[PDB]
Design a protein around this ligand. Structure first.
Ligand SMILES: NC(=O)C1=CN([C@@H]2O[C@H](COP(=O)(O)OP(=O)(O)OC[C@H]3O[C@@H](n4cnc5c(N)ncnc54)[C@H](OP(=O)(O)O)[C@@H]3O)[C@@H](O)[C@H]2O)C=CC1
Ligand SMILES: COc1cc(-c2c(C)cccc2C)cc([C@H](C)C#Cc2c(C)nc(N)nc2N)c1
Length: 157
């Protein structure tokens, strides 16, 4: 399987100044559970906004930088290399990678953040005419998770 994994708001904002605009522990747990034991593919900027690979899964970074070498990170230099990675692969961000991959993935795991944030990076537009709703699960609000959010699993029709 080739999947997208993304959290976006009502206007498809995914980022602001190389950070996420929201803090939602429930969504981070969601990411952890889906991707532990599998593969994350991300653009260079997304990786550098964290600077350390996520434990207990393969972290793949796409960059043109032939000098890129980070301990615990595998590097690729072409979109075409993504198709050679084994197992379940998750396109993890950012805007550029989403734009390049949205037409290619089998399915999408989307956390819809039910708010409107200031952003400078966006998930590309998509229509539910192209995607079946495999599941739609309301996130639980509480002390530490105070923005309404819905976990969607979308599969290409
Ligand atoms: N809300 C969410 O779920 C998520 C949000 N984000 C956010 O997204 C933002 C970053 O997005 P964006 O600026 O688009 O950056 P990206 O993370 O997509 O990185 C862009 C870089 O990736 C590399 N790259 C992309 N395509 C190719 C290619 N075909 N060949 C070689 N290298 C390639 C290039 O690296 P190089 O220049 O080194 O060659 C390029 O400059 C941040 O704000 C981050 O917070 C990210 C993931 C998820
Ligand atoms: C090391 O590469 C990364 C690690 C993390 C990271 C996570 C997910 C949890 C705890 C700590 C860290 C550092 C995040 C990212 C990017 C910003 C992303 C993302 C994302 C999120 C947050 N939610 C949904 N649904 N999809 C997503 N792609 C990259």
């Amino acid at each position: 399987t080739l999947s997208i994994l993304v959290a976006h708001d009502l206007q498809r904002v995914i980022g602001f100044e190389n950070q996420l605009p929201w803090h939602l522990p429930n969504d981070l747990k969601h990411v952890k559970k889906l991707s532990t034991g599998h593969t994350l593919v991300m653009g260079r900027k997304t990786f550098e906004s964290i600077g350390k690979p996520l434990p207990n899964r393969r972290n793949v970074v796409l960059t043109s930088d032939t000098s890129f070498n980070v301990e615990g990170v595998d590097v690729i230099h072409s979109i075409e290399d993504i198709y050679q990675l084994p197992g379940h692969v998750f396109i993890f961000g950012g805007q550029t990678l989403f734009e390049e991959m949205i037409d290619k993935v089998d399915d999408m795991y989307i956390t819809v953040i039910e708010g409107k944030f200031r952003g400078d990076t966006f998930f590309p537009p998509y229509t539910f005419e192209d995607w079946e709703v495999a599941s739609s699960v309301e996130g639980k609000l509480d002390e530490k998770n105070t923005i309404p959010h819905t976990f969607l699993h979308l599969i290409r029709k």
